[PDB]
Symmetry: C3
Subunit: 114 residues, 3 copies
């Protein structure tokens, strides 16, 4: 899977080990091996949410399976909690788009997973 | 909804109020509440369009509904107009990808919209 | 089509002509005219792959058609080869998400391709 967070929070406010916490927490939540989890954090962005430049985040989670109604509700609670605790972003200023990818549409290591 | 613009135009060339202008114009175009509209502008990017590094933009609009044949033509006219007037980018050097998101696949405020 | 690479490799390690090289190789691989190929390279990113931050890349290819099982395997070999030879990124630390876009969902030049 891949998880991306784009935020206006400054780089200095991203705590050490944040990529590792995302990796481990997502491995547990999705059930996928940590070796297959990629994470990408983009601070200092020029962004607004509801017209306001207070701290916010736009995120995405792509996974081959492990995406659905109940699972995405659980992911949102986990990820909003982490963004609130670690980046001080209010959950009502976070979007997370979820993508259930077909294996044939995910390339890796000179091929695709299909 | 969420609107992202990636561009090679430098940050100093993005005028004041551009995030607000995008927020207001997208609220009217999509009909969605301004409170739910998120905007993200990424200048100074290493990009080419048609092999050329002249000013260009790659954009995306994600929305729960309000995406379709006619609506997307109207959004493209509005958004290319703004990128031309405000960033001086020619409309034939802009792509905008449109995504009609299922409510179950959009997280916000510790939950999803499903 | 549009190809985006996000990588932790620093900007100074992105060789001259890399955007043109991607444009040319993608024009041939997708069969599309190079005038329609857009490329975007984002170096210096805060990323981890499988828990570590050795060089890695998260990429996407969006195209109206020319996406499928066999084609995506071919694109992955081409693109991982280029990331390995030019950016020194191991193919097993690259993900590429493929998107077959409907023409009605791609805006360009004040309209869409539909
Ligand atoms: C069905 C769709 N892939 C198609 O035939 C096409 C090809 C080239 C450009 C287009 O806008 C659309
Ligand atoms: C159907 C679903 N995509 C599936 O069963 C799968 C699981 C794990 C890896 C993978 O590539 C594919
Ligand atoms: Cl970190
Ligand atoms: Cl589910
Ligand atoms: Cl898919
Ligand atoms: Cl929406
Ligand atoms: Cl129309
Ligand atoms: Cl969806
Ligand atoms: Cl590391
Ligand atoms: Cl195919
Ligand atoms: Cl589509």
């Amino acid at each position: 899977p891949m998880f991306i967070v784009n935020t206006n929070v400054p780089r200095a406010s991203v705590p050490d080990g944040f990529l590792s916490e995302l990796t481990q927490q997502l491995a547990q939540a999705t059930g996928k091996p940590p070796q297959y989890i990629a994470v990408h954090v983009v601070p200092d962005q020029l962004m607004a949410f509801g017209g306001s430049s207070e701290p916010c985040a736009l995120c995405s989670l792509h996974s081959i399976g492990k995406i659905g109604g109940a699972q995405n509700r659980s992911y949102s609670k986990l990820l909003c909690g982490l963004l609130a605790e670690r980046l001080r972003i209010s959950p009502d200023r976070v979007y997370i788009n979820y993508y259930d990818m077909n294996a044939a549409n995910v390339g890796w290591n000179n091929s695709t997973f299909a």
